């Protein structure tokens, strides 16, 4: 499942660097150039979403009270509910990833960095395994980069 | 103080329309040309700010615990703090007016409509009485309309 592996690599890398505050120079292994531009786009757009909704996100995280690995399945349930109206678009997708990055920052703060990888896999699972055909029709991460292109 | 009267009229009308949910056709009285387009712009931009920050605003309103007329002056204190870095721009101003409308909606919900006018006056007081020179340099509400032109 190349699409899952590529997607996990991008989302995992973004959540990791957000939680640590450091952009890893390690090259993308399973993303093939398109992933590099996607991560670059996700940094710009994902960071802006977090700045726009930081206080809202804090309240959501508090209500969810995610403290360990078995709580990540609540973010999975939330994402399923988001898409339950049958609508899919990149704004929704990148808002969920950005909330994921916000949660990862919190997990690192409370010495729960081990939960960041399972969090990323949970997010990628919903995206790729329930929205596969839509992603493929958008040409995957290339469509993501094009959609958020800055003039 | 024409600038105060013009500004109060715009902000008062917007807060009241939001609280009741009904766009009044009553013409603006002391706002001239800029006033008509300003309320139109404030409706578009202000409604979008509230959509963008509804949940954050709800939490803010909860922490402030505004229940009656004495509590209304806390928004003016919040506005003073917002501008304490010496920076002024229309995004800040409209975000504060939009939160004011969000509060006005709440006041109506708890049968405190009498507090909406004092809230509008407190907002207008901070804007006009502490940022007068900046407003005049921006060409007042005409600059507001141009800045947010679509």
């Amino acid at each position: 499942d190349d699409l899952y592996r590529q997607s996990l690599e991008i989302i995992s890398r973004y959540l990791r660097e957000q939680a640590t505050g450091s952009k890893d120079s390690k090259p993308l292994g399973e993303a093939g150039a398109a992933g590099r531009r996607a991560l670059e786009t996700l940094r710009r757009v994902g960071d802006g979403v977090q700045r726009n909704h930081e206080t809202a996100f804090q309240g959501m995280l508090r209500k969810l009270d995610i403290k360990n690995e078995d709580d990540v399945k609540s973010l999975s349930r939330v994402m399923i509910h988001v898409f339950s109206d049958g609508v899919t678009n990149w704004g929704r997708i990148v808002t969920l990833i950005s909330f994921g990055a916000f949660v990862a920052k919190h997990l690192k703060t409370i010495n729960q960095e081990s939960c960041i990888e399972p969090l990323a896999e949970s997010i990628t699972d919903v995206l790729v395994r329930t929205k596969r055909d839509w992603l493929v029709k958008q040409r995957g991460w290339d469509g993501f980069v094009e959609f958020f292109h800055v003039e | 103080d024409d600038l105060y009267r013009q500004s109060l009229e715009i902000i008062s009308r917007y807060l009241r329309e939001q609280a009741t949910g009904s766009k009044d056709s009553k013409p603006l009285g002391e706002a001239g040309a800029a006033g008509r387009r300003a309320l139109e712009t404030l409706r578009r931009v202000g409604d979008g700010v509230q959509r963008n920050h509804e949940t954050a605003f709800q939490g803010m309103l909860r922490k402030l615990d505004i229940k009656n007329e004495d509590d209304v002056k806390s928004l003016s204190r919040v506005m003073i703090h917002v501008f304490s870095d010496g920076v002024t721009n229309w995004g800040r101003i409209v975000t504060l007016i939009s939160f004011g409308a969000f509060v006005a909606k709440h006041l109506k919900t708890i049968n405190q409509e009498s507090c909406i006018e004092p809230l509008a006056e407190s907002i207008t007081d901070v804007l006009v009485r502490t940022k007068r020179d900046w407003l005049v340099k921006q060409r007042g509400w005409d600059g507001f309309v141009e800045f947010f032109h679509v």
Binding site: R51 | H81, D85, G91, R92
Partner: peptide
């Protein structure tokens, strides 16, 4: 008073500046 009002102001200031930048761009 001072403490919650100051934190709320910082949030509104941030929101205000993020929004301003989408039109001043």
């Amino acid at each position: 008073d001072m403490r919650p009002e100051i934190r709320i102001a910082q949030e509104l200031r941030r929101x205000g500046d993020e929004f301003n930048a989408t039109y001043a761009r």
